[PDB]
């Protein structure tokens, strides 16, 4: 090029390519210890010509629907995706644009504490009213009325309105002390007897004035008086029928409401609390917003002529979970995006495996008075008989204080808030005297129901990795600690009426990253408008009942062409037009979907597949689901899907795939397929074998050393050569090891400690008297040792019998069809075997399950090739071939 450039190697010759061959040899020789490759620039130059068009074409495109349609529960839009000529669109860039208004319902509360009176003593009166309350301000006179004199130019009084005794002003500006001396003037705002008297927490009261007053349609200066002295007005409390509210607070001991209308009386003893927090935001990768896997509302992508569809979906390829897996195996998932809403769900690993390690307190944690000395005693003079000094009141003895156990109390609060409230509804009690909604799902009820600290408070499985068994089978991601939901409902903001400008990708495999060719293409897709199935909530409460709505505004396709120079774009066109040059794709999960309903509470479940070819079968993968949270997406709507939380069906979530005791397989009646015996149990895939004389349980858990050779041997392809921890580049977020979790504790024996009791949960007594009896009540207790946790430690430890689980969540069991259970190829060794390639086989194969009283349904996959080939013969015509080798989606009968 220009000589000045090549002189500086700006765009000249490659680093090693201009230096004398001797020096290149030298550097290539001594590079590990004396490297010289960093001292000479090697120029890099982008392609000069025929790489980007100059003919003034768009770099990004705007596509507006040709026709729209609004249904009571869905939204249909048909686009006109017409790529120009001598240009190529990669559909990967194409992504829908959504605008509208969303109402998250009253169940929304994106926080846990309370915004109101947030810090007061959560159990005591907004000065109420007969009389009872308080006064902070100080004065020199109270007038015939006029008020108490704030005082000024030879006169000045205050404003029953707000510049009254602004509830937060004070004599405070005295300090250590203040002392309403005979100032004859206390004063302050007391609520009036027509306004509910809720607790002092919560109390909101919409500002009504400007100066921050609180009244209604203007408040009256009463004039409570002396100290039993006489007419001598001393106090002028201002009374203010406010509009009390309490958004954010569910009471927890309304004393026996005298009647059905005491808005006042003695309820000055009502406690109150925060409301449980539920964030409510759109599903991860906007899972469910578009109509995937539902044949009814399937989309289309066909040339503008010959409207023959080119995207044909089924109910077995579960394209949502497949996409969510794809992000994992091709991303990190610990990196929040904002456009695809790519924030993965997650549970605080200190919440499902809570290690009650104990408190870290070793020191009294004290509470010293506000001045450093109270209750002093006046003394005076000296035995030298009172020289120049009723005054000088020195407090006697030693300071007065009272301690707190900060470290323990904070941990107790964490336990109650985090692994106490989310117990199954059975263990959760209702408050003493507050009515609850009849429906068991609405946020009003489950919020009103209150947990009990007695069940889980620093005396459960002490110092041992153990998820409270009642919490073992409950969903972990329906939790305010859910980082993904946490952020995603953090992102849209807070409160109601949240307008949303969202962008949704294309998750369908045959369209996900199809490379389009010139020609105009019609492109319509159907969007779920059902609120409950598109928004996540931390409590899994039904959303469409308690209140919610998503109104769509406009839906626009958006694509970004690559401005390739037409000179090369045309060659690429005629070049991908070739028959042999055809494209091809595949679904990532690449396997059928087979739900299997289990009886509400059952021990086992067999299944059967009539004789069928398994030409390219690869292996089975399965898990468990809770039927309350799996949507049958075979219809455009499902009125029976009341659950709102994470959906393991198609949201990557899996949290029960450890309750399987073991599985069995058998080909057509009797051909079991572990095989010509290989596994330690030659026919029974063992996963939760509970009693050993053979010692088949692997880790210190209660797995089996054949299952933990079938897992971690098809996932990480390790085994036969020593079980070593696998590197993170082959251990993804949804992998096996990442989520495996053993644990154990000891429980007091039942046949040895002949003093063994069965002291229930409302009859314990530990930490008694510094807590509340049953619920999150208040402290009316007493003191006498304790007697729940029978010491399993120290000198007087009792006998002990062990227990162990293997909590493994967010991972699916795999039983690869390969002969040796190795990842020897996508199309397995044994899959191509002659016997299975020429003569089909039926299948009978059954599972165990720990009995869950909540109805549950199975989940099984057959790891089936889902290939696709997409060809475009002429400008504007697209032809596709779908296939599923072992589970073909169509045969001679259609």
């Amino acid at each position: 090029m220009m000589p000045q450039w090549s002189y500086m190697h700006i765009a000249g010759q490659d680093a090693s390519e201009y230096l004398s061959p001797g020096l290149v040899q030298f550097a290539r020789a001594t590079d590990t210890y004396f490297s010289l490759g960093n001292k000479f620039r090697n120029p890099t130059v982008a392609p000069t010509h025929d790489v980007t068009t100059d003919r003034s074409q768009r770099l990004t495109l705007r596509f507006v629907p040709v026709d729209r349609e609004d249904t009571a529960y869905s939204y249909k839009v048909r686009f006109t995706l017409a790529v120009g000529d001598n240009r190529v669109l990669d559909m990967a860039s194409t992504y829908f644009d959504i605008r509208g208004v969303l109402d998250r319902g009253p169940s929304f509360k994106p926080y846990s504490g309370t915004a109101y009176n947030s810090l007061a003593p959560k159990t005591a009166p907004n000065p109420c009213e007969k009389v009872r309350g308080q006064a902070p301000f100080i004065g020199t006179n109270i007038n015939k009325d006029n008020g108490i004199q704030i005082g000024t130019d030879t006169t000045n009084q205050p404003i029953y309105a707000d510049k009254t005794y602004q509830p937060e002003p004070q004599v405070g500006q005295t300090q250590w002390n203040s002392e309403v001396g005979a100032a004859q003037k206390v004063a302050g705002r007391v609520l009036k007897d027509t306004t509910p008297m809720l607790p002092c927490y919560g109390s909101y009261a919409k500002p009504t004035n400007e100066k921050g007053g609180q009244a209604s349609l203007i408040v009256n200066l009463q004039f409570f008086a002396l100290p039993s002295t006489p007419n001598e007005p001393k106090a002028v409390l201002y009374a203010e029928n406010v509009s009390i509210e309490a958004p954010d607070t569910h009471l927890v001991y309304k004393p026996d409401v005298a009647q059905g209308t005491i808005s006042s009386a003695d309820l000055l003893t009502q406690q109150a609390a925060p409301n449980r927090p539920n964030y409510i935001g759109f599903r991860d990768n906007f899972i469910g917003l578009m109509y995937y896997n539902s044949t009814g509302n399937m989309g289309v992508l066909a040339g503008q002529a010959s409207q023959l569809n080119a995207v044909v979906d089924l109910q077995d390829r579960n394209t949502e979970l497949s996409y969510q897996l794809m992000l994992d195996a091709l991303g990190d998932r610990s990196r929040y995006f904002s456009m695809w809403n790519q924030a993965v769900d997650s549970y605080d690993p200190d919440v499902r495996i809570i290690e009650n390690h104990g408190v870290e307190d070793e020191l009294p944690n004290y509470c010293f008075p506000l001045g450093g000395s109270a209750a002093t005693d006046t003394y005076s003079g000296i035995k030298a008989n009172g020289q120049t000094w009723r005054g000088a009141e020195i407090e006697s003895g030693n300071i007065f204080a009272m301690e707190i156990n900060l470290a323990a109390n904070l941990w107790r609060s964490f336990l109650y808030s985090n692994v106490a409230l989310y117990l199954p509804d059975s263990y959760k009690i209702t408050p003493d005297n507050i009515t609850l909604p009849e429906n068991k799902n609405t946020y009003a009820y489950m919020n009103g129901r209150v947990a009990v600290p007695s069940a889980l408070d620093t005396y459960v499985n002490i110092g041992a990795r153990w998820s409270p068994d009642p919490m073992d089978n409950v969903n972990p991601f329906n939790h305010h600690r859910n980082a993904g939901l946490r952020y995603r409902s953090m992102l849209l903001g807070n409160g109601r009426y949240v307008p949303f400008h969202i962008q949704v990708p294309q998750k369908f495999f045959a369209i996900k990253n199809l490379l389009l060719l010139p020609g105009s293409y019609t492109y319509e897709w159907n969007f779920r408008k059902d609120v409950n199935m598109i928004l996540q909530s931390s409590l899994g409460n039904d959303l469409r009942v308690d209140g919610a709505s998503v109104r769509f505004d406009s839906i626009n396709l958006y694509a970004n062409f690559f401005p390739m120079a037409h000179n090369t774009a045309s060659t690429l066109e005629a070049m991908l037009r070739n028959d042999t040059n055809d494209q091809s794709f595949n679904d990532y999960l690449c396997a059928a979907n087979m739900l299997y309903p289990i009886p509400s509470n059952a021990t086992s479940v067999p299944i059967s597949i009539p004789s069928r070819n398994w030409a390219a079968f690869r292996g089975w993968s399965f898990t468990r689901l809770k039927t309350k949270e799996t949507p049958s997406l075979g219809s455009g709507f499902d009125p029976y899907f009341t659950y709102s939380g994470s959906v393991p069906y198609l949201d990557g979530t899996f949290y029960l795939n450890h309750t399987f005791k073991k599985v069995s397989i058998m080909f057509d009646s009797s051909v079991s397929w572990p095989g010509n015996d290989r596994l330690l149990t030659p026919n029974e895939f063992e996963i939760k074998r509970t009693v050993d004389g053979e010692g088949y349980n692997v880790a210190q858990c209660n797995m089996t050393k054949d299952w933990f050779l079938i897992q971690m041997l098809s996932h990480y392809n390790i085994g036969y050569q020593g079980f070593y921890v696998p590197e993170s580049y082959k251990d993804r977020m949804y992998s096996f090891f990442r989520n495996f979790q053993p644990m154990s504790r000891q429980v007091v024996n039942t046949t040895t400690y002949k003093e063994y009791q069965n002291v229930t949960l409302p009859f314990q007594h530990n930490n008694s008297g510094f807590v509340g009896y049953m619920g999150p009540t208040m402290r009316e207790g007493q003191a006498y040792p304790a007697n729940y946790p029978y010491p399993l430690i120290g000198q007087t430890a009792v006998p002990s019998l062990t227990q162990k689980k293997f909590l493994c969540d967010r991972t699916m069991w795999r039983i690869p069809f390969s002969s040796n259970f190795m990842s020897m190829g996508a199309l397995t060794d044994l899959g191509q075997n002659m016997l299975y390639a020429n003569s089909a086989h039926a299948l009978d194969m059954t599972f165990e399950v720990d009995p869950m009283d909540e109805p549950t349904l199975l989940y099984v996959l057959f790891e089936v090739f889902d290939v696709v080939r997409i060809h475009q013969p002429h400008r504007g015509v697209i032809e596709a071939v779908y296939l599923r080798t072992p589970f073909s989606a169509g045969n001679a009968t259609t």
């Binding site: 069995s664 009646s669 154990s744 689980k805």
Partner: protein, 50 residues
């Protein structure tokens, strides 16, 4: 509300007995020396070693 009160209990097809331990009955079972067990209940999904 479904009561099989007029049918021949067995319409639904039956499958081979799984043939493994545990699931053939749900009455209290006895251990080698006598320490009983639970047939299909919880506390049998935990590795209760000694």
């Amino acid at each position: 509300a479904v009561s099989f009160k007029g049918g021949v209990f067995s319409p639904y097809l039956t499958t081979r007995l799984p043939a493994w331990a545990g699931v053939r009955q749900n009455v209290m079972g006895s251990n080698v020396d006598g320490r009983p067990v639970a047939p299909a209940n919880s506390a049998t999904l935990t590795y209760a070693t000694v």
